[PDB]
Design a protein around this ligand. Structure first.
Ligand code: CHL
Ligand code: CHL
Ligand code: DGD
Ligand code: CLA
Ligand code: CLA
Ligand code: CLA
Ligand code: CLA
Ligand code: LMG
Ligand code: BCR
Ligand code: BCR
Ligand code: BCR
Ligand code: CL
Ligand code: CL
Lengths: 62, 257, 448, 37, 60, 32, 336, 38, 34
């Protein structure tokens, strides 16, 4: 599970980087919070899912 | 004169139905995330606890919403009785009371092989309930089948309830399929229309809390193999040492250092 | 945002444009909160990664891990780190929590409501509304009280707190009898700040530490309920400036005091800041030197009690100006120091001569020897030792970093009181922008 | 050190604590972009 | 011993009160100053020309 | 030297993530 | 109008018609500063020698005991006292209080309250006169420096004997020992402090010379140029554009302040910020966070240490270290 | 030819980063090689 | 020395009490502006 866990952590880091830059850009963009608001929630939801996935996988790997 | 009033002195009764009913009813997402025009139109704020929450578009018309609300209220009321009844007897046994079959998912086995159960009229004396398993199965099924059929057919036998005294079959007519009132409201707390609307909101909200709670009781039973009280007592005893992650670990985690 | 054309504040005073924009001001405070939680998480993981078990905590430049250790995480008896996994989850939990805190800061700042007074009356406020201001003061006063109760719950029900004075050696201990006596609590609060007294920096039991946090937790909750159900009285209404900048200056003056107190806590206290994790204090290291030379010279053969120094005072042992037998030399100033390794040798009258020459345990000698070499002396570039030392040891005590930094923060935030409180009065009076050319007050006064 | 499972990610942790000081500079470069309006 | 002294130094006494007479010194003085202040509050506020209602005090 | 190479690489992203936001908003005519 | 005693007292206290403003900070400033002034003058003239190091070796600091104005000083409290509170009533006799350095604590404690109240009194008069309230902020810089050498440095070191003596030669002993133990010259904050006072001295000379160079002709040569200015003038007494033109050509056009308000803020900020950091420097060095230590930083290929100017400083620091408090140290490390 | 101007704030940002990088290298060199006491 | 201590406690309390109740006497209202 070590390889699976590290892939999930790496995916969590990548999606966090996308949110770090993506979220302020769409928020500052006037149309962004009206139209891209749908895809932001998907990013937030995926980010939280990886948080819990990495959290449970930590138990089986540490 | 009124049968309803405030709880904190004169002019302490402030029932705001606007927050739970109408256009400004609270929603499952805040104002800045979900616009009120994005809510399913069938959810117009006339039913208790209409948080405007229905992804997957399950309710597509008033009839479908009414049919499902009949299911939701029943699943909710049963869960409220179950949530309370699944953990209260176990809490008694853990504190020293003589209860046989404390955990809810082990009470059935206690009645096997001719064993009986002790019913605790908690404020007062306990009981060595003599009903055997065959009898309990027969009586419970007969009473429940009869009770549900009366609800299904919306008609029942004449009888006595304290709020209405002695009633005949006529009272069953003109009773809401979900909020019968009448004999089912002996204390008459449904008299005030504003109070009744607010109390309906509290019913499903406590009911929805109970349904999710019993779901946890079941999932927790499968995972930790203990009763819900045992899970709570040991989370509170050692929170970081006893939670989901520690159980999933299932091994003596080597010190990192 | 805004600009100087419509606000009158330049870019370097740009955050002053948020004084009456409650919604954006909320996001500003939530975003800085996310930064604080981010730093706590990031610095925690940084210290855990750079942690080597072959050295003590204070030799590795760690200032956050000692705070976790004093709470009794991953420490065995004697201040030995047994497991750093609890330190890891602390860093991760803060780091992840900063993300959601950061999102709310960015949301409430960039795209949320500018002013909450219209859409959200519960959260909306105007600085002039003394009643509404007290409710916010009352509400956040309760959460502070609850935070204090978390400490006592940790010390009494959840594992316990590391006690450096514990019988049998320093260890994580459950506090079962917190000291909640009014005389003890009031004794610390209204004690002198001078030597021997040390105000509240002299709390020397975990019973008194968590006994005090029981009082603080209770007072803050009652004060929270009080300030929620009451509006300020007439005497207060005629004593304070009721402006947003005025409320800020009150807090700046308050946390300036808290900054100075934390500076003295990290420098003198050995209970809430165990020497096992933060290293020896200034007094402790000086006291350890004479103890080390007393022990080693006894083996060479010498009566330490009868030994004279060049000045005629006791070379190893002398009397304090109150009569207690103390260590000699320059460390005579630090005679009020008390430490877990030194109290066993101290009787009612001071250091016991018999115990000093018959019953000095090896662990006591090792503690004093270690504390002397790790004295809180170092350079800016972290060269251990006095200024007249070679570049050999890379060490500065965490007490030096904690005391030195939080004094600079304490002083600058005192200048914050002076600045933001002066401006608060002038702006309210209405002359923060200058003297009226046609209505100069001095021109209407009798000449001196 | 970190747990063995988190070892490959150690270099990221080694640069994390300097991020908060970048926000101060980020505010400065943000104001420069808008010509310090 | 050879001389007499208060011997209260470094003893952690509340407000430095070694003897109860110091308590009376502080209490009496504070009460007097508070006494003359208390009977003058209305006059001082009257100068403001406003009544000390819930909207009284320097406010921006 | 793989450690320092990875540290500089990670440092390169974060010191660029901030300015990346500003330039994207400036280029796209954002409300910055 | 006011009839109440307190109403009349509070009007007198806050009255701006007094020759010297009292205010509420003045009811704290005046008694504390007069108390410290009285004991200082009496002690500087007639105080007995003080056992500063706690080693029963009294140090004479009074004029009547053989000192002149330069060498006279109020000796700090005894090292035996430490940080302990030593009021005159905690001493068996006033002779014992004098012997142990009592007057130093009385002066320092009342003086610290005086400067803090003097700072507040500066704010109070500004509020009473309707001017902007930040002269007190500029005064916080010297207050911090005074607080650092009289309170914070003794606090961190553990004894009031390590405070600055209240004398001229006593001040020099404070600086020399400070260099030997902390290497203050190599600390970036004394460096900022030096830039604060060298720069402040430079800016004072430049601003004074530039304004004097631009005085508009309003007098003859048999009169002082000062006579050209009348107290209360509504017009400017010197040409700011002319002064900016001179300094603009002196270095280059954009190195000069065209704005008198920006110029005067710079004249205030530069020394105040500089003194803030050097005050912090002493405060940080109170907790033994010494200046830069570059001793034996340069070594050759085979390991031989090549000396630098920093090592020569260490040689001087070594000499002061082994001579200060000659009889006070029984053990090799100067941890106190 | 190609019409355009480099934004001034971008020039300051890149120059500011380069200066910070240069100072960082000097502080890095303070701990390694010559003058590091090592 | 106690007599001296009580005298100083009386004096220090007197000036501190004036300072405390002085600023409680509608101090913010004592300004030349309107
Ligand atoms: C209506 C919901 C209901 C649910 C969710 C369960 C759930 C369960 N029953 Mg159960 N029962 C339910 C109703 C009833 N049971 C029984 C009689 C029993 C018995 C006799 C036993 C169970 C057992 C069990 C457990 C094993 C399957 C399980 C958790 C068995 C078990 O393993 O319990 C520990 C078991 O022995 N049930 C009766 C008639 C009295 C019921 C009447 O409604
Ligand atoms: C005629 C006999 C008759 C009997 C013995 C029962 C008995 C029962 N019905 Mg019921 N019902 C009966 C007729 C009828 N019911 C309903 C409609 C309902 C509903 C909608 C619900 C019940 C529920 C219940 C249960 C709890 C009631 C309660 O809290 O009461 C004491 C009150 C205090 C209970 C076992 C409830 C239930 O099962 O909850 C889990 C429930 O939600 N009944 C209708 C149509 C209006 C009936 C018509 O005759
Ligand atoms: C009026 C003019 C004097 C101003 C104050 C001077 C005294 C301040 C001081 O010497 O000390 C300040 C005190 C700390 O006092 C010290 O408190 C210490 C408490 O430690 C004791 O208790 C500890 C408990 O673990 C340990 O056991 C330790 O070994 C033991 O010695 C010691 O008692 C020292 O003797 C004692 O001087 O803290 C505090 O009051 C915190 C509040 C003051 C902050 C610093 C002042 C900043 C002022 C303007 C800026
Ligand atoms: C002091 C912090 C604070 C305060 C006072 C407010 C206040 C407000 N928020 Mg906001 N918010 C915050 C933080 C805060 N928020 C954070 C951290 C986030 C990121 C999750 C958000 C995200 C957010 C959104 C998306 C929206 C608001 C909105 C609002 C407005 C009302 C509706 C609402 O409550 O929505 C938010 C409700 C929740 C976030 C539910 C959270 C569940 C509980 C309250 C969490 C409590 C957990 C616990 C106490 C936290 C521990 C402390 C922690 C720091 C460790 C209101 C004025 C709405 C608005 O502005 O309308 C236009 C809106 O759409 N907020
Ligand atoms: C706490 C409320 C309450 C109470 C105290 C009673 C009490 C009583 N009910 Mg009643 N009942 C109630 C609620 C209540 N009921 C409700 C809500 C309903 C509607 C479902 C009924 C429907 C009902 C019927 C149909 C009958 C009774 C009957 C009775 C009497 C005998 C019950 C029995 O032992 O045989 C059962 C008894 C005095 C019986 C009766 O009236 O005696 C002739 C009977 O026929 N009840
Ligand atoms: C803790 C520091 C801090 C915080 C929280 C704020 C917060 C705020 N400032 Mg401010 N400011 C600061 C420091 C700070 N400032 C400093 C140091 C200066 C001096 C240079 C200024 C000077 C200043 C001025 C001149 C102004 C503000 C203004 C504002 C407000 C609106 C800004 C805006 O909408 O423009 C938009 C900004 C952008 C579009 C660029 C930033 C994009 C995001 C936020 C960058 C962060 C990305 C982040 C990593 C994403 C992760 C979040 C999540 C996905 C995990 C806002 C509440 C304005 C105001 O007053 O409102 C009226 C304004 O006029 N500030
Ligand atoms: C730490 C947060 C906090 C803050 C910011 C405030 C702020 C305020 N409080 Mg409050 N209070 C708090 C905590 C807090 N309180 C707690 C925890 C309690 C419970 C003990 C109280 C109990 C309390 C009461 C009973 C009263 C106030 C009052 C006031 C107002 C007058 C301020 C004043 O003159 O006090 C300045 C301090 C002094 C004048 C002397 C302090 C002496 C202390 C007790 C010991 C010496 C140190 C003010 C807005 C008054 C008010 O306006 O009523 C609404 C009021 O009478 N507070
Ligand atoms: C209401 C009217 C009066 C309320 C009590 C006033 C304080 C009592 C007299 C002072 C006193 O000596 O208290 C004595 C009490 C009794 O407690 C003893 O006190 C001694 C001297 O303070 C020592 O500290 C002892 O350790 C302690 O046991 O302790 C206090 O000082 C608490 C006073 C503060 C709280 C008062 C109530 C609020
Ligand atoms: C408003 C505004 C401002 C500010 C802002 C801010 C301040 C923000 C913040 C923000 C934030 C505060 C953010 C945060 C974030 C975080 C995150 C996103 C996290 C992440 C994490 C991860 C990704 C993972 C990690 C890990 C673990 C899990 C374990 C170990 C390993 C590792 C480390 C890998 C400014 C100035 C610009 C100006 C303008 C306006
Ligand atoms: C946790 C983590 C994360 C996150 C991160 C972050 C949150 C970041 C951010 C960051 C940032 C926040 C950045 C920014 C920075 C800034 C900059 C880089 C800038 C600078 C500037 C300069 C240098 C210049 C300035 C100036 C101007 C232009 C004007 C004039 C003056 C001067 C020139 C000075 C990640 C994703 C990694 C994942 C993993 C984990
Ligand atoms: C936790 C703990 C503890 C403690 C506790 C407590 C209980 C605390 C408290 C404290 C308190 C309980 C209090 C304090 C403080 C307060 C203050 C410091 C302030 C005052 C202020 C002010 C500001 C005044 C003012 C005035 C008035 C009258 C009004 C106007 C005018 C004037 C401004 C003049 C102990 C020690 C055991 C240790 C361990 C831990
Ligand atoms: Cl000397
Ligand atoms: Cl020594």
């Amino acid at each position: 599970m070590l390889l699976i866990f590290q892939l999930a952590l790496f995916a969590f880091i990548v999606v966090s980087f996308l949110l770090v830059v993506g979220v302020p850009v769409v928020l500052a963009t006037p149309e962004g919070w009206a139209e891209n608001k749908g895809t932001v929630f998907s990013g937030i939801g995926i980010w939280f899912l990886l948080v819990f996935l990495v959290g449970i996988l930590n138990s089986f790997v540490v | 004169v009124s049968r309803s009033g405030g709880w904190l002195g004169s002019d302490s009764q402030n029932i705001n139905l606007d927050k739970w009913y109408g256009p400004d009813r609270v929603l499952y997402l805040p104002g800045g995330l979900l616009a009120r025009d994005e809510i399913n139109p069938v959810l117009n704020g006339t039913l208790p606890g209409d948080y405007g929450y229905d992804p997957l578009g399950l309710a597509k018309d008033a009839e479908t919403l009414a049919k499902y609300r009949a299911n939701e209220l029943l699943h909710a009321r049963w869960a409220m009785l179950a949530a309370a009844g699944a953990i209260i007897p176990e809490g008694l046994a853990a504190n020293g009371a003589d209860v046989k079959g404390a955990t809810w998912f082990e009470t059935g086995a206690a009645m096997l092989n001719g064993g009986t159960l002790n019913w605790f009229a908690v404020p007062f004396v306990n009981f060595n309930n003599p009903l055997p398993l065959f009898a309990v199965v027969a009586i419970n099924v007969a009473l429940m089948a009869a009770a549900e059929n009366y609800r299904r057919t919306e008609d029942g036998p004449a009888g006595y309830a304290p709020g209405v005294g002695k009633f005949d079959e006529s009272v069953y007519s003109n009773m809401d399929n979900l909020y019968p009132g009448g004999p089912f409201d002996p204390l008459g707390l449904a008299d005030d229309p504003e109070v009744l609307a607010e109390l309906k909101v509290k019913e499903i909200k406590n009911g929805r809390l109970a349904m999710v709670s019993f779901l946890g009781f079941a999932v927790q039973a499968a995972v930790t193999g203990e009763g819900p009280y045992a899970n709570w007592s040991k989370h509170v005893a050692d929170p970081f040492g006893y939670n989901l992650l520690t159980i999933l670990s299932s091994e003596d985690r080597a010190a990192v250092l | 945002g805004r600009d100087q054309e419509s606000t009158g504040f330049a870019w370097w005073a740009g955050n002053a444009r948020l004084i009456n924009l409650s919604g954006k001001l909320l996001g500003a405070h939530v975003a800085h909160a996310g930064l604080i939680v981010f730093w706590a998480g990031a610095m925690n993981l940084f210290e855990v990664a750079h942690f080597v078990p072959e050295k003590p905590m204070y030799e590795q430049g760690l200032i956050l891990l000692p705070h976790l250790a004093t709470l009794g995480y991953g420490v065995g008896p004697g201040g030995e780190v047994i497991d750093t996994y609890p330190y890891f989850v602390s860093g991760v939990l803060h780091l992840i929590s900063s993300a959601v805190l950061g999102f709310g800061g960015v949301y409430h700042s960039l795209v949320g409501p500018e002013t909450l007074e219209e859409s959200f009356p519960f959260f909306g406020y105007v600085w002039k509304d003394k009643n509404k201001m007290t409710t916010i003061l009352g509400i956040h006063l309760i959460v502070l009280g609850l935070g204090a109760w978390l400490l006592v719950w940790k010390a009494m029900y959840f594992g316990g707190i590391y006690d450096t004075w514990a019988p049998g050696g320093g260890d994580v201990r459950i506090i079962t009898n917190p000291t909640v006596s009014p005389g003890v609590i009031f004794g610390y609060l209204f004690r002198s700040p001078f030597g021997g007294d040390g105000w509240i920096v002299s709390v020397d039991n975990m019973e008194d530490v968590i006994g005090g946090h029981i009082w603080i937790g209770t007072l803050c909750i009652f004060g929270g309920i009080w300030h929620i159900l009451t509006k300020p009285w007439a005497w207060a209404r005629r004593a304070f400036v009721w402006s947003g900048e005025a409320y800020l200056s009150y807090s700046l003056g308050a946390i300036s005091i808290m900054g100075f107190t934390a500076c003295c806590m990290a420098w003198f206290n050995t209970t809430a800041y165990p020497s096992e994790f933060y290293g020896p204090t200034g007094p402790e290291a000086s006291q350890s030197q004479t103890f080390t030379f007393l022990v080693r010279d006894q083996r060479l053969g010498a009566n330490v009690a009868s030994a004279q120094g060049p000045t005629g005072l006791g070379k190893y042992l002398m009397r304090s100006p109150t009569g207690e037998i103390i260590f000699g030399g320059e460390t005579m100033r630090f005679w009020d120091f008390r430490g877990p390794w030194l109290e066993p040798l101290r009787g009612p009258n001071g250091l016991d001569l018999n115990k000093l020459k018959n019953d000095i345990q090896p662990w006591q000698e090792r503690r004093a020897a270690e504390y002397m070499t790790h004295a809180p002396l170092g350079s800016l570039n972290s060269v251990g030792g006095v200024a007249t030392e070679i570049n050999a040891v890379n060490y500065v005590s965490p007490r030096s970093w904690l005391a030195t930094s939080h004094f600079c923060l304490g002083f600058f935030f005192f200048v914050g009181h002076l600045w933001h409180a002066g401006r608060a009065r002038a702006a309210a009076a209405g002359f923060e922008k200058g003297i009226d050319r046609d209505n100069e007050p001095v021109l209407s006064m009798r000449p001196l | 050190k970190l747990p063995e499972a988190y070892a490959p990610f150690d270099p990221i942790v080694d640069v994390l604590p300097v991020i908060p000081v970048l926000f101060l500079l980020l505010a400065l470069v943000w104001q420069a972009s808008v010509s310090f309006r | 011993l050879v001389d007499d002294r208060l011997a209260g130094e470094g003893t952690g006494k509340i407000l430095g009160i070694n003897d109860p007479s110091l308590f009376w010194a502080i209490t009496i003085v504070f009460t007097i100053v508070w006494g003359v202040f208390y009977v003058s509050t209305r006059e001082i506020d009257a100068a403001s020309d406003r009544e000390n209602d819930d909207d009284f005090g320097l406010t921006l | 030297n793989l450690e320092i190479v990875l540290q500089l690489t990670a440092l390169l992203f974060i010191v660029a993530a901030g300015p990346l936001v500003i330039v994207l908003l400036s280029s796209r005519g954002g409300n910055l | 109008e006011s009839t109440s005693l307190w109403a009349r007292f509070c009007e007198w206290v806050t009255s701006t018609e007094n020759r010297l403003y009292i205010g509420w900070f003045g009811v704290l400033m005046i008694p504390t500063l007069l108390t410290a002034t009285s004991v200082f003058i009496i002690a500087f003239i007639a105080a007995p020698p003080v056992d500063i190091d706690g080693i029963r070796e009294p140090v004479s600091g009074s004029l009547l005991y053989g000192n002149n104005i330069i060498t006279g000083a109020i000796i700090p409290t005894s090292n035996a006292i430490g940080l302990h509170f030593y009021p005159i009533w905690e001493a068996a006799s006033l002779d014992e209080w004098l012997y142990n350095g009592g007057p130093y604590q009385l002066i320092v404690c009342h003086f610290f309250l005086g400067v803090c109240s003097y700072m507040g009194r500066e704010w109070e008069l500004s509020f009473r006169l309707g001017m902007r309230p930040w002269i007190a902020v500029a005064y916080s810089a010297p207050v911090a420096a005074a607080t650092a050498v009289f309170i914070i440095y003794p606090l961190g070191q553990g004894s009031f004997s390590d405070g600055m003596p209240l004398g001229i030669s006593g001040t020099f002993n404070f600086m020399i020992v400070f260099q030997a133990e902390h290497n203050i010259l190599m600390h970036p904050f004394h460096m900022l402090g030096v830039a604060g006072v060298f720069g402040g001295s430079l800016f004072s000379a430049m601003h004074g010379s530039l304004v004097t160079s631009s005085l508009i002709r309003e007098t003859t040569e048999n009169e002082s140029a000062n006579e050209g200015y009348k107290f209360g003038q509504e017009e400017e007494t010197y040409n700011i554009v002319a002064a900016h033109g001179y300094f603009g050509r002196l270095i280059f056009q954009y190195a000069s302040f065209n704005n008198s308000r920006s110029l005067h803020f710079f004249l205030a900020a530069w020394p105040v910020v500089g003194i803030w950091f050097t005050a912090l420097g002493i405060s940080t060095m109170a907790f033994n966070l010494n200046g830069f230590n570059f001793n034996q930083s340069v070594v050759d290929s085979q390991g031989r240490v090549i000396n630098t100017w920093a090592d020569i400083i260490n040689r001087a620091n070594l000499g002061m270290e082994v001579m200060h408090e000659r009889n006070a140290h029984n053990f090799p490390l100067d941890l106190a | 030819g190609t019409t355009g101007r480099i934004p001034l704030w971008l020039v300051g940002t890149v120059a500011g980063v380069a200066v910070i990088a240069l100072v960082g290298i000097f502080f890095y060199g303070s701990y390694v090689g010559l003058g590091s006491s090592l | 020395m106690l007599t001296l201590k009580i005298f100083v406690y009386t004096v220090v309390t007197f000036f501190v009490s004036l300072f405390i109740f002085g600023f409680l006497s509608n101090d913010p209202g004592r300004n030349p502006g309107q």
